[PDB]
């Protein structure tokens, strides 16, 4: 301490760290061109203007949703599977999995790009939910995401074929508990020997607090624009902050690991398949 | 097998059963005069007529609530603490606790009568929530139940003093996970050496499924009008069904246990304190 990025890379290369837990947020997906709905200059922002939302978070609040589900469904249509592709940061995580290093990847993102990059569902915790499935808000019948796709793409609010209630994608709204898969953290975090935090400001609970659940000996590597949350006001001696652009931090780590050419080959072959 | 009610009583009197888990539903509270909101002949039913609910369960459904919280708040006003008192069945459970037999009492009821009868919160799992606390539906600020009492009693929808959102009592609505305290069942049920099920038709999940979580050797005593749910289609050899009026079944068990005079003294002294 302080450890450097190169030290963390050597810990991995020497097989001193064998079980990596990863936490990711919106910063890993901006490079795929996913618009920040809350910032001017995207089709999504402009499409949301007509609704004059009181504030951006209302898009994931139940009282607002029931009053008018159209803004949320504007976002759903943009983020529904097939529109965006994973980028280098996702394929780095996929390569990490393929090399036997991934214990679990916890994501706050709802773009589904981790599964699209080919990481097994069993290795993933989609902590803020998924568009792969949906639930009637009235009768609780579950539906595959594909079942409401036609309505979503046509700007029709999806209705339940049994009771006519609004059918909502399984995205976690504020105030709702995270999906039960989130409870894997109880066993996963004490088992981790390295924590990687990529592209997140750690502003949402209870996801953010996971950073404290690894053992005091376990290095915590942050690759992010700045120092954030519990990492910023709860510094440990084995914390490494690689502050900067997320993709550049990943590219640096990948080169230190010795994986550059392999990563490039993987990315070329994968994107073609999409 | 089949065991009788008298056999279960002897198991308790001989201290062969020392750790009782209890599950209760609406049948234990009808004797306190709590109206079934979904049946003609009560002030509550009549007060709910003006809203012409499509069906009774809508009172605990979020889409309906947000569309019109007034029916739910009509129910809240009726059930808010201080209106109803516990009856003999609650005081039987209180006496069970006082005699060192209660591992945990799981209730589907939201009338709060278990805590009013003097059973410690630590022994209780209020699985369908409580009017003792409330949460802003928009900003998630918690409030003591007492903070919204004035509005509830005056038929005003309680609004949040910080963001003006509707403040909703912590009652579990359909589709919502049960409170995290419900997870005590994971440890409690395997630890139980007797399961008592009182006054419930076991029609709501995931509460109903708890009946299967005790060990195959553990007797399951049902005191209820009829045979219900997993007990009815998943009979075990140590199941006892005391079918009949709930209070009469309790009074019979109490007499077999040898607790009648003590129970009567307890009830007299407790109700006075209210």
């Amino acid at each position: 301490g302080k450890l450097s990025l190169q030290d963390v890379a050597e810990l991995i290369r020497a097989r001193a760290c064998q079980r990596v837990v990863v936490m990711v947020g919106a910063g890993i997906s901006t490079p795929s061109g996913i618009p920040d709905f809350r910032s001017p200059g995207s089709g999504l922002y402009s499409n949301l203007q007509q609704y004059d939302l009181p504030y951006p978070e209302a898009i994931f609040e139940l009282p607002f949703f029931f009053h008018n589900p159209k803004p949320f469904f504007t976002l759903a249509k943009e983020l529904y599977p097939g529109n965006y592709k994973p980028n280098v940061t996702h394929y780095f995580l996929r390569l990490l999995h393929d090399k036997g290093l991934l214990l679990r990847l916890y994501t706050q993102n709802i773009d589904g790009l981790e599964r699209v990059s080919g990481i097994p569902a069993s290795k993933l915790v989609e902590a803020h939910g998924t568009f792969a499935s949906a639930t009637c808000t009235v009768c609780q019948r579950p539906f595959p995401g594909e079942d409401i796709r036609a309505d979503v793409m046509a700007d029709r609010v999806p209705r339940c074929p049994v009771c006519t209630g609004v059918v909502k994608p399984d995205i976690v709204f504020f105030g709702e508990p995270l999906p039960q898969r989130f409870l894997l953290h109880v066993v996963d975090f004490p088992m981790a020997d390295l924590l990687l935090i990529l592209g997140t400001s750690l502003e949402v609970e209870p996801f953010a607090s996971l950073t404290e659940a690894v053992r005091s000996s376990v290095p915590r590597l942050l690759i992010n624009r700045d120092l954030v949350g519990p990492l910023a006001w709860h510094p440990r001696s084995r914390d490494v902050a690689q502050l900067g652009d997320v993709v550049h931090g990943v590219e640096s780590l990948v080169e230190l690991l010795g994986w550059t050419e392999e990563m490039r080959d993987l990315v070329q072959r994968e994107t073609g398949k999409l | 097998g089949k065991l009788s009610l008298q056999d279960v009583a002897e198991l308790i009197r001989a201290r062969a059963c020392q750790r009782v888990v209890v599950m209760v539903g609406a049948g234990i509270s009808t004797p306190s005069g709590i109206p079934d909101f979904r049946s003609p002949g009560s002030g509550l039913y009549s007060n709910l007529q003006q809203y012409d609910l499509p069906y009774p369960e809508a009172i605990f459904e979020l889409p309906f609530f947000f569309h019109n919280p007034k029916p739910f708040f009509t129910l809240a006003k009726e059930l808010y603490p201080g209106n109803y008192k516990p009856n003999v069945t609650h005081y039987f459970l209180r006496l069970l606790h006082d005699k060192g037999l209660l591992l945990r009492l799981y209730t589907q009821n939201i009338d709060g009568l278990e805590r009013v009868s003097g059973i410690p919160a630590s022994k209780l799992v209020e699985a369908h929530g409580t009017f003792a606390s409330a949460t802003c539906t928009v900003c998630q600020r918690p409030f003591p139940g007492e903070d919204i009492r004035a509005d509830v009693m005056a038929d005003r929808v309680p609004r949040c003093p910080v963001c003006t959102g509707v403040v909703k009592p912590d009652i579990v609505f359909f589709g919502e996970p049960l409170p995290q305290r419900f997870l005590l069942h994971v440890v409690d049920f395997p630890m139980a050496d007797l399961l008592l099920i009182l006054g419930t038709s076991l029609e709501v999940e995931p509460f109903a499924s708890l009946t299967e979580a005790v060990r195959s050797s553990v007797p399951r005593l049902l005191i209820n009008r009829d045979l219900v749910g997993p007990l009815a289609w998943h009979p075990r050899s140590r199941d006892v069904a005391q079918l009949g009026d709930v209070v009469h079944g309790v009074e019979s068990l109490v007499e077999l246990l040898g607790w009648t005079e003590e129970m009567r003294d307890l009830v007299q002294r407790e109700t006075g304190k209210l």
Binding site: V172, G175, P177, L178, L202, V204, E205 | Q140, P177, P179
Partner: peptide, 7 residues
């Protein structure tokens, strides 16, 4: 609390 909330 169980709920998703901004910190």
């Amino acid at each position: 609390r169980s709920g998703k909330v901004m910190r």
